[PDB]
Design a protein around this ligand. Structure first.
Ligand SMILES: [Cl-]
Ligand SMILES: [Cl-]
Length: 306
C-alpha cells in the first residue's frame, strides 16, 4: 500500500486494490496457509482423505481454527467446485495457489473475487511456493516469508532431535510412488515438481538419477510400466501409500519383487486414508503435526537400504 497487489499466474494476472479481509480458499492445503498466518477462512474446501467427510477437516487444520476461536466453514465441494457456496461466503479473495483449476474454473471464480492461481501447471506447487503465492494475495508476503523460515526451523529441530534418523536418511535416494499391489502392471512415480516428492528433500533425502527420465513439465506424476521397473534399481528407498499387506505383496510380486528397494524391504508404507497419508503433501500446519511420525517411518524404512 498504496501499491495494488499484482499476481502473475497460469491464467494471466490478478489485481487487488487493497488487502482482502474475507478469505476463501479452495483445493488442498491453501486454507492452512491462511490459518498459519492467523486468519480463519470464510470458507474452504472439504476433505475426505484422512478424515470422514462428515467431519470434513483434517486434525491440524481443526486445531488451528480452534486456537483462533473460529469455526470451520466448509464448502460442500467434494464432487467439484461449488460456485454457489463460494459466492455465498462473500469473499474478497480466493486462494488457489496449489490447485487443479481449469481456465473455465478460473473465469467463473474470478467473477466472484480475485483468484490467486498456481504459476504454471495444475497441482505443481511446492509447499514454500504455495505459501508465497497464497500469502502474496493476502498482502502478507513478508509474513509468508517468516512462516517459511519458521517451518524450516521446525523441520531442522525435529531432525536434530533424532540424530540417528537424520543420519540414516541423509543422502538416501528416494522415490515417492503409488503402487497398487493388486495390479503391478503399471504404477506411478511422483515427479520433482510434486510437493510430496520435493518435501522428501527438505528432510535430507535426494532423488535418484532415474527420476530425471520420468520428468515432464506436463504433470506431477508419471505412469510407469512394470517393464521399466529395472530403471529404478538406483533408489535406496521407495515410499508408497498402502496397508499391512503392501510390503509382503510387493516382495512376492513376480514383476516388481526383484527391484532393489523392494527386495531389501526398504519400502516406507504410508497407511492409506490416515492423517499421516494426507500430510504427505505438506502444509505449514501439517508439518508440525506429523513430522516426528513421518521421520520415524522413513527412518525405519531406510535402515533396510542396501
Ligand atoms: Cl483438493
Ligand atoms: Cl497466529
Amino acid at each position: 500500500a498504496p501499491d495494488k497487489i499484482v499476481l502473475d499466474h497460469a491464467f494471466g494476472q490478478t489485481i487487488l486494490d487493497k488487502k482482502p479481509e474475507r478469505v476463501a480458499t479452495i483445493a488442498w492445503g491453501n486454507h492452512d496457509v491462511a490459518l498459519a498466518l492467523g486468519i480463519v477462512p470464510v470458507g474452504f474446501s472439504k476433505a475426505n482423505y484422512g478424515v470422514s467427510a462428515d467431519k470434513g477437516v483434517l486434525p491440524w487444520t481443526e486445531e488451528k481454527i480452534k486456537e483462533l476461536n473460529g469455526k470451520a466453514n466448509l464448502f460442500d465441494d467434494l464432487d467439484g467446485l461449488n460456485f454457489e457456496a463460494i459466492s455465498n461466503s462473500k469473499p474478497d479473495v480466493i486462494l488457489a495457489g496449489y490447485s487443479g483449476i481449469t481456465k473455465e474454473d478460473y473465469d467463473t471464480l474470478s467473477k466472484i473475487a480475485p483468484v490467486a492461481a498456481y504459476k504454471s501447471k495444475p497441482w505443481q506447487t511446492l509447499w514454500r511456493d504455495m505459501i508465497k503465492i497464497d500469502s502474496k494475495a493476502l498482502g502478507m508476503e513478508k509474513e509468508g516469508d517468516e512462516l517459511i523460515k519458521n517451518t524450516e526451523a521446525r523441520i531442522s529441530k525435529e531432525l536434530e532431535k533424532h540424530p540417528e534418523i537424520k543420519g540414516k536418511i541423509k543422502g538416501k535416494k528416494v522415490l515417492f510412488t503409488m503402487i497398487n499391489a493388486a495390479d503391478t502392471s503399471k504404477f506411478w512415480i511422483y515427479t520433482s515438481k510434486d510437493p510430496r516428492a520435493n518435501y522428501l528433500t527438505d528432510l535430507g533425502l535426494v532423488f535418484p538419477e532415474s527420476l530425471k527420465e520420468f520428468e515432464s513439465e506436463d504433470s506431477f506424476a508419471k505412469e510407469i510400466s512394470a517393464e521399466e521397473a529395472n530403471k529404478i534399481n538406483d533408489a535406496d528407498v521407495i515410499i508408497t501409500y498402502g496397508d499391512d499387506k503392501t510390503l509382503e505383496a510387493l516382495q512376492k510380486d513376480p514383476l516388481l519383487g526383484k527391484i532393489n528397494a523392494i527386495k531389501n524391504g526398504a519400502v516406507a508404507v504410508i497407511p492409506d486414508n490416515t492423517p499421516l497419508a494426507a500430510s504427505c503433501t505438506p502444509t505449514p500446519l501439517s508439518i508440525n503435526y506429523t513430522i516426528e511420525e513421518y521421520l520415524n517411518l522413513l527412518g525405519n524404512a531406510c535402515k533396510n537400504a542396501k
